[PDB]
Write a protein that binds this ligand. Structure first.
Ligand SMILES: COc1cc(CC(=O)c2ccc(C#N)cc2)c([N+](=O)[O-])cc1OC
Lengths: 274, 231, 255, 41, 231, 41, 59
């Protein structure tokens, strides 16, 4: 099919393809056949695995949180006791997927979530309880749960999923951005104010995901850890940028740590060392 | 009820599978697409754009100077710089090419290495870039280097020289992670004649080096990168 | 008879000429254009001042010395006080625009130096304080004076290590953005045409800067023996295909 | 490839774009530059 | 038996899924449909009907007066009322529009705001309604207000003035939950000339304000409302 | 969309009505009123 | 000036109604030309007829 290199022989002309001027801002498509004698070879390659659809198309962990099943008697702040918990939806908490997404400026896609819940009984327990988890999506404007047993968990309009601990939850969500694409970066503010926040933290008000355990308490305490995975599908990306070099310090902002190790390796020897 | 038999694997979560799943927001109508310039479809598109190589990574910390290759006046046949070609490490590790290359296990194809002269217009010079394919050591003197793939560059009106590093290998794919069997060879530069400065000129002269991929290029087996962590 | 070296650009009643350019860059190969009905959302009929705002405005010249780190401007911020363009920015709720950036710097065939001139869409700056500190409105709206990368940090401001592009990415990869170099031995000017790049059809021109322009010395300046150890750098910008929408009272911004 | 669900978001991955045009990044210059011809004429 | 592999998610109960299920009452024959007037197919149908806005929500408790906007005789260029345009809160929160809007996360489109004069027939007045798009503060005097979208209303035989609040935004959708980035702006009303009463008339004059959506309107991402609870 | 069950109640959701006529609520007046013409003539 | 020298000047025409510009910024806001000294030695800036009444007095 496609040729990787054409057959090219000796050369002696005034057409010098290897002499350019990089200050123009262009990367002239020079080939090996332009500076050496080559033979014919074929690609036998389409580059399907480097398509943005494939690059962002696999599940990556985007959040880990914890909730627990125990007696709620006396507990004043259920949220703090972790009788139920929150997740202010965002994809820049765990760095692996974040660096990939931030290889672009604007990004548009549907999301496929997979939520894994694992039980743990650190203290004395006679058996492993069979708990059912309820993950409810709380869009901005919806009433937030205050107690693991609010009226809010009725979830009449909020979408929510019920699944066994140890099992996995799965569903997809359409592209919910308010604009035509999501912003990986935002050089702006919410309004013209002297103190207001800067960055995409201003655009990322996606709401929360409330997690709880439907079962009443058992004699012992059970610790359920929840892991949320995200896979993008039907991907579109715009304006590629320089890859993240320094470590992250916060969700949403480009801030980097003070006093960080150099990122570029230093030669063990000369600039002439191999 | 249709008789079925569940196969091993049932229940597993393979982060790589690609199946259908119910939508949690039925009937939701996403925002219309509008035109946005600069759409990217494949990473192979962008690694063809060259970026600066921090060739002179001889400093105590990261700095603009790491990208400046010093060139000295009236030096003759001497070496200007050298480096092995493990594109997933060394000087290349932080470049756009190196950064993207590290998101994959295998690579193949030809590299595009170029040098742009920044010394005064009234100065002159002739350098020689050389690619030494695997099998022998990195050249130790111009003669040794010149015996392999090379380009004699005449500094002039056209400021940049583009030397291609033609895919020279037996096995048709190399590992991005530095591996001896799959080593790519060495890159070196020497003085063909010398750098000559005009009168009233004493300032240091520098070279800027760039690295990019040719359409030749291929990357396989996506994997996580060692260039980011937290924790 | 013609050449990439010699060029003329005329917008409105302003014309710039150069006899030592190196072609010109059109970001992502797209020329600026007006907002088409199919992409529009805001129902207000827009205003197109045309020639009165789509012209070249020249900012204060910077001084390139042997120790300069670089400079960073932001658009449309950099032109907020420029004639009618500026006025329209504050009197309207929304607006969109493209630009033609022309950076000038001439020396002699004895000098040497290389400036990187790049346009970065959505250049979200980082706080030098790290952690999760923000960057106050004032500091990302320097106006035509722009940000000096060799100046000291300041409470509420952004980090300024040229090396990390003020955002945690390495300088060397800034080339993935539409750019051009002003290499004194070749160049005299750099020209970049910027089309409107945003995830929305039109936006607020005061609370959001669409792109930032950076002029960064890569190969340091060197002058012939006994010559003045500095050269001036001048930035001239002209908006194009500018549209304003939702006119109301004049906006009042932080400081 | 039978879609069991009603919404588009439910469907699986899109499949290779097969567009692949790097020039908008590698050659975003105003005046076309031909390989072999003087970069600066 | 047909070989199958169960995928992750099996067993889950997604309150939003839409699948088939066996009928617990097989062969049951439901009652015949008869004609019933007033059928509703879409909530977007009903939010186009306007309801009264409790603009004057300045009272100690809820009351009919909350809907009465006081207008004063022989006052000149003074402000009659003001409000921001967070339709999912403030004065709008209890209206049919606000109530329905709160069942969704996103909204877009144009609003229909109208005022009906109730003062004596032999009285006269000229008011000016004004919409101030986001980006600047709520107008502090008539001049400031008049510089943006507005309508000069002449009280007369036709009792109601209908000022539309044209969709004026960059991003094509706003949040129903009050959010700064997506703020909609401000609505204000002032005296263009003044209210004039006829002889033997001293009673207070009031305005009734209504709010509804234009066919322009759109709502997305259904969610629970903060307007009801128990537990 | 193959119905596995015998009864109608078993089938899934109906899909958009696509009728959308607000006038029976917004304009339930006896004498037609044209936009632009005097509401009270 | 000598061939090996360089310079970039800016000529500007300020139409009637305002004062003669007092600094480059003020001047640049009106009709102007940025001139790059080079091989072509002469810059030609036209002063386009900018007037309401269609004729002016020589006096
Ligand atoms: C499974 O958990 C959910 C997650 C989300 C958030 C979402 O899909 C999203 C993805 C990427 C970006 C970016 N950039 C912003 C938001 C939504 N949601 O937004 O509606 C609902 C969920 O459960 C209905």
């Amino acid at each position: 099919q496609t040729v990787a290199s054409i057959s090219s022989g000796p050369k002696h002309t005034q057409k010098v393809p290897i002499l350019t001027a990089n200050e123009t801002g262009a990367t002239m498509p020079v080939l090996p056949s332009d500076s050496i004698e080559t033979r014919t070879t074929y690609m036998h390659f389409n580059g399907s695995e480097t398509d943005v659809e494939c690059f962002l198309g696999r599940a990556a962990c985007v959040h880990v949180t914890e909730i627990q099943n125990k007696d709620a008697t006396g507990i004043d702040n259920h949220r703090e006791a972790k009788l139920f918990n929150d997740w202010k939806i965002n994809l820049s908490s765990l760095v692996q997927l974040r660096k990939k997404l931030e290889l672009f400026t604007y990004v548009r896609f549907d999301s496929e979530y997979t939520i894994l819940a694992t039980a743990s009984q650190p203290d004395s327990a006679n058996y492993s309880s069979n708990l059912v988890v309820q993950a409810m999506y709380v869009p901005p404007g919806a009433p937030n749960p205050k107690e693991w047993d609010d009226y809010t968990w009725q979830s009449a309009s909020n979408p929510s999923v019920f699944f066994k601990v140890g099992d996995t939850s799965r569903f997809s969500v359409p592209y919910v951005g308010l604009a035509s694409a999501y912003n990986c970066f935002y050089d702006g503010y919410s309004h013209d104010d002297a103190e207001t926040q800067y960055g995409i933290t201003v655009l990322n008000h996606m709401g929360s995901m409330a997690f709880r355990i439907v079962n009443e308490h058992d004699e012992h305490k059970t610790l359920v850890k929840i892991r949320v995975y995200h896979r993008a599908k039907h991907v579109e990306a715009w304006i590629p940028r320089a890859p993240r070099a320094l470590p992250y310090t916060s969700i949403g902002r480009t801030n980097y740590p003070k006093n960080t190790e150099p990122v570029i390796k230093k030669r063990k020897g000369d600039i002439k060392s191999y | 009820g249709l008789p079925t038999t569940t196969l091993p694997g049932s229940g597993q979560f393979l982060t790589t599978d690609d199946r259908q799943s119910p939508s949690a927001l039925p009937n939701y109508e996403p925002t219309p697409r509008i035109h946005i310039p600069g759409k990217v479809h494949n990473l192979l598109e962008i690694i063809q754009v060259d970026t600066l190589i921090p060739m002179n990574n001889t400093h105590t910390k990261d700095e603009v100077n790491s990208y400046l290759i010093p060139l000295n006046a009236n030096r003759q046949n001497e070496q200007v710089f050298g480096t092995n070609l493990f594109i997933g490490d060394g000087v290349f590790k932080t470049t756009l090419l190196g950064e993207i290359v590290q998101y994959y296990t295998h690579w193949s194809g030809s590299l595009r290495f170029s040098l742009m002269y920044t010394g005064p217009a009234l100065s002159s010079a002739k350098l020689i870039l050389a690619y030494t394919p695997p099998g022998a050591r990195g050249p130790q003197d111009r003669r040794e280097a010149m015996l392999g793939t090379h380009v004699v560059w005449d500094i002039g009106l056209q400021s940049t020289i583009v030397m291609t590093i033609p895919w020279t290998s037996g096995v048709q794919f190399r590992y991005t992670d530095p591996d001896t069997y799959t080593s790519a060879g060495f890159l070196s530069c020497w003085y063909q004649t010398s750098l000559i400065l005009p009168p009233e000129t004493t300032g240091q002269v520098y070279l800027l080096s760039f690295i990019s991929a040719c359409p030749d290029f291929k990357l396989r087996l996506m994997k996580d990168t060692q260039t980011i962590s937290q924790t | 008879g013609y050449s990439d070296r010699v060029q003329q650009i005329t917008l409105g009643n302003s014309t710039i000429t150069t006899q030592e350019a190196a072609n010109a860059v059109v970001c992502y190969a797209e020329w600026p254009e007006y907002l088409p009905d199919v992409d529009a959302s805001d129902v207000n009929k827009t205003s197109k001042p045309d020639t009165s705002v789509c012209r070249f405005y020249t900012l204060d010249s910077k001084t390139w010395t042997t120790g300069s780190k670089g400079w960073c401007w932001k658009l449309p911020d950099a032109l907020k006080d420029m004639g009618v363009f500026g006025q329209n920015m504050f009197f309207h709720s929304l607006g969109r625009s493209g630009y033609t950036v022309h950076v000038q710097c001439n020396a002699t065939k004895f000098h040497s130096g290389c400036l990187l001139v790049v346009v970065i869409p959505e250049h979200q700056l980082a706080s030098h304080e790290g952690g999760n500190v923000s960057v106050k409105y004032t500091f990302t709206h320097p106006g035509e004076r722009g940000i000096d990368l060799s100046s000291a940090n300041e409470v509420g401001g952004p980090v300024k290590d040229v090396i990390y592009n003020m955002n945690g990415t390495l300088l060397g990869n800034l080339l993935i953005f539409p750019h051009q170099f002003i290499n004194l031995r070749t160049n005299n000017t750099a020209t970049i045409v910027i089309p409107y790049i945003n995830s929305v059809p039109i936006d607020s021109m005061t609370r959001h800067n669409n792109v930032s322009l950076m002029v960064i010395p890569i190969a340091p300046l060197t002058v012939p023996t006994g010559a003045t150890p500095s050269l001036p750098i001048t930035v001239t910008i002209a908006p194009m295909c500018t549209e304003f929408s939702g006119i109301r009272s004049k906006s009042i911004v932080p400081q | 490839v039978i879609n069991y669900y009603k919404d588009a978001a439910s469907t699986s991955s899109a499949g290779q774009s097969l567009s692949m045009d790097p020039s908008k990044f590698t050659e975003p210059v105003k005046d076309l530059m031909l390989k072999g011809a003087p970069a600066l004429n």
